[PDB]
Structures are given as C-alpha cells and as structure tokens.
Amino acid sequence: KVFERCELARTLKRLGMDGYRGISLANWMCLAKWESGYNTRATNYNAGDRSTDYGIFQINSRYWCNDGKTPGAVNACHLSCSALLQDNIADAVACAKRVVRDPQGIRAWVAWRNRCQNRDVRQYVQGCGV
C-alpha cells in the first residue's frame, strides 16, 4: 500500500510512535518519506553486501529481519522480512521500535541523517490532526 501523508501520521500515532525513545512523529514521517515514499512494498537490494531493505522504513535483512538469503544475518526483530511487506504496518512499527532501542536511535538510518537531521521537519505532520 502507498499511504497518504496524514493517513500514515495518524496510523503511526495510534501505534505509539509519537515520542517513542524521544523521537517525534514528524521525525518518523521524514524517515518514511525518504526511505520509501510511504510505500509498504518497497524493496532495495544492496549488491555490495547481499542484504535487502524491506518496506516502509527500509529495514535491512542483515541485522533486523530474516529473509534466509542474507549472509551473517542476526534477525534482531525475530521476524520474517515478509512481514515488512504487508499493507498493515504493525509488525514494521514493532521492528522499528526495536531498532531505535539501540544507542544510535534513529541515526541507524543514513537517510534520516541526510534528509531530516538538523532540519525543520514540521512540514510532514502539518494539517494531519496529530
């Protein structure tokens, strides 16, 4: 599914993302925008290290979810990567919460550093009722 901006903002809020580990909803929205364009079906294969990024938050198969075909996988979310390609994002959200429980927090995603950090991100949630 491709979410509309404010539909995703309200969904994330209901799923407990606002302020999770200190991360505002706008920061989560900026992450999702730049990782996938709000698209749950997004996948990106990294030929260099043989891992794949899955779903709306582009969660990687070396450290977080298991796809069976990535060398040196850890499966820290204890989830099949296929769960991150569903239209329902509850499993993706649970795994993203797990990612940010590590010290780096949302900096785990490079796209957040490039596109979101130290920038005005209020635009992503304006007018959404959140």
7 labelled catalytic:
no
Q: Running DSSP on this structure, what letter comes out for residue 125?
A: T
Kindly provide the resolution of this structure in angstroms, with one decimal: 1.1
State the SS3 of 73-101. Answer: CCCCCCCEHHHHHCCCCHHHHHHHHHHCC
As a whole number of angstroms, the distance between CA 29 and CA 46 comes to: 24
The coordinates were experimentally obtained by X-ray
The residue whose two tokens read 């959404």 is 128
**74 phi and psi, to 5 degrees?**
-105, -30
The pairing of beta strand 59-60 with beta strand 51-54? antiparallel
Q: Is 38 left (phi over 0), alpha (psi -120 to 50) or beta?
A: left
| Angle of helix 25-36 versus helix 5-14 axis, rounded to 10 | 130
Kindly name the residue from 53, 87, 91, 120 that is annotated as catalytic: 53
Q: What domains, with CATH codes, occur in the chain? A: 1-130 (1.10.530.10)
Kindly name the residue from 35, 49, 67, 120 that is annotated as catalytic: 35
